[PDB]
Amino acid sequence: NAMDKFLITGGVKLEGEVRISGAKNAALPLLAAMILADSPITLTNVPNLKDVNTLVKLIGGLGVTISYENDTVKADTSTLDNQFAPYELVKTMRASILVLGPLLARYGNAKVSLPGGCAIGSRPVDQHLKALEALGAHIEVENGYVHATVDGRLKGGEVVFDMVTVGGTENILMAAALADGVTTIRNAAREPEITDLAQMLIKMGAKIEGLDTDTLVVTGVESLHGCEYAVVADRIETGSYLAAAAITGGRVKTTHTDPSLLEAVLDKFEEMGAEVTRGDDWIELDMLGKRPKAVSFRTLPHPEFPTDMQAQIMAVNAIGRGFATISETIFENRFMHVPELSRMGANIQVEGHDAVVTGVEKLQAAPVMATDLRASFSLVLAALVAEGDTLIDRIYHIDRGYEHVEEKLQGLGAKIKRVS
Amino acid sequence: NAMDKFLITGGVKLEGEVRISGAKNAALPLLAAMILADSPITLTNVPNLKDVNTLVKLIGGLGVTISYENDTVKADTSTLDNQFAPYELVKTMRASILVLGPLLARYGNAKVSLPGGCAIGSRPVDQHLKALEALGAHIEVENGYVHATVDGRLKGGEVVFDMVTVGGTENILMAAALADGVTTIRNAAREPEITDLAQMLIKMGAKIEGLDTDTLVVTGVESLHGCEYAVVADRIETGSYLAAAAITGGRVKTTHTDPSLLEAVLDKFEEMGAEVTRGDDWIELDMLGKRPKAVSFRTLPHPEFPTDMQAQIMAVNAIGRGFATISETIFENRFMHVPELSRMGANIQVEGHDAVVTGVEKLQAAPVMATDLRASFSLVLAALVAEGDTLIDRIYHIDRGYEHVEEKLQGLGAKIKRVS
């Protein structure tokens, strides 16, 4: 939907509640894990996102019978007839690579297009392939496809990630679940989407120790069954809507969430001067009509400050008091929103992966262009506080990760319209 | 032209000649300089490129009477009626900012949209603005527009670039040419497009000392007149077509060029094992049917190895003999071709701005996507040597900098077709 734009009038102090959807970043590996199920499997709390639809399409293309209605995906792998992920879908989304592990582990074969570039500057998939080789996979990468094979089951092995990789951890965890023997996975990602995947695998019959730690110990089983599972709440969507309160001086309650998924972010909101109240499954941020204090942060793997909140908190800092330091350590090209925020009057100075934001009293509306998922939400935040009417082009990126975004913001009083 | 593609069959040893067009990177500042001319001005050897057409459109939008036919741009500023460069064109290309200096210097007013992001990761335009302020400009950046004003003429001053900036040097050189007094420009870019601009300004009546050095000394004049000027040959187009010989083991003669514009590149071709012959205005590279030796390089300001040749030489190195240590120092996100070359079988390892290419004997055709101007030519080079039929999507980027690229390559024996 390359032509869609948002038209936003800034200046409304946002107030109300938002129901948080299932995590985009958990839905994708959980969908891939359905390939492992030997009886029908149902996922609920699934957000209606572009990436979800792409992976549902990919899985259907394997021959799996699959339905996606409302927030619910049902899949029956009895009809699966191939292990092929085509270029046309994989170029749409790197996360399509998450089918590699389960296809290989269950069927002994997988052919998946080699991912190309990621707009925000990603590492190649080398670590995913190395991990699978540690379990006995033979991997050829040629004519633009990864060809992975194994005779019989993968074999339990010793996997160690040289750098933290969320997707590599997911891929190998799925593969190890059906391997013959015990697999150790060291330097595993601790992101809670890993834990959510592990819990669903356990519900399906897997044997996994070390949840929420950097060392996962998997005892492979012969087969996994279907189950019903609800996707964990989206911690990034949660932080994003709380940031909408922070930037506008308002008060937003996010329901159907879990503050334990985003403690580092909540701490930063408190440092801004916000009053953060919470319960077991809800959070409220009240900025009390105050200008937030600018807060420094360094993106790092969970449980530290998440890269997927960086652009959004940078936007809040743009109108914050004082100045703040930002360091992106996870991605190589995740400051694409900076020149766009600068068009709206922000004072941001960058050198490589380090940025310094000097907060300004007011932003001014100007036409801007979204470059990636979280950048699009960063520009929405800026537009919500800016003086005047901002047009944001290429807003399609937002649909990869924020369902019903216009509706959710309108419910808080936002003057926002999608033209498409 | 977002959906144009190239379909290339690799494996032909390329042989023949290519007439080199005027430099894209000189045509843009020379076009902007036409704003200074108090009588009709004519540029010849102008390449028919998207960026040229954009700047011609922008200049026409100022009210300047302008015609672009064949390789010739004719302009008469007698009808100029505004000093405004709109968002819609500036978001098309950063180089639209080159009208800022001459508009301000001649008319005392310029309103130019603030450039947003550059795909390959560029610095902001802060240095351009600081330089203009050194000549007495008042600059307000608001509602996404740079508003520059001065009462009467700019005043000669001391300009110092803290980092080399080709566009900043161009903008300030044009502005200084009409200032009242003497301007010193230190740490000036030495790119030969600066020299070409300076020579045209001198032909128009300007007073400029220090050509081809890092210290330009400008004595402002009251007015500049029109002239007829021929754009310097394109050194990057030259290197690009010589690289097509190198990668295919062929023999290509580039005519209408100047080897003194690209000595660092020619030395690297010799290091590959190619026979480079040359005259005053032509070059021939004969690779003698041999596999090139992989060659290391570090991009640096002219006269060192140019960033605008990096992607192309990386493609040649992908099939070369040995390791090539490639270091990019000019742009922050100019390895976007790496994942695409990897899809074709290249062995390239990246860490930040450092890359290591391990040459492979053969590439295999696979669908790939161009991400920027020079990346698109890099993928064309890879497709020309790869085994099979490569489809390159988003080839429109190539039209920003390579005139008649299909025809020029077809003249060398290439099996290349544009579908559009």
Ligand SMILES: *[C@](C)(OP(=O)(O)O)C(=O)O
């Ligand atoms: C990268 C991997 O891009 P993609 O999802 O493939 O568009 C990312 O944004 O993380």
Ligand SMILES: *[C@](C)(OP(=O)(O)O)C(=O)O
């Ligand atoms: C940057 C500046 O992008 P643009 O020309 O504005 O598309 C570049 O490629 O140098």
Ligand code: NA
């Ligand atoms: Na993700």
Ligand code: NA
């Ligand atoms: Na191979």
Ligand code: NA
């Ligand atoms: Na970068």
Ligand code: NA
């Ligand atoms: Na800035």
Ligand code: NA
């Ligand atoms: Na340029």
Ligand code: NA
């Ligand atoms: Na642009």
Ligand code: NA
């Ligand atoms: Na301002």
Ligand code: NA
């Ligand atoms: Na004359």
Ligand code: NA
């Ligand atoms: Na690689």
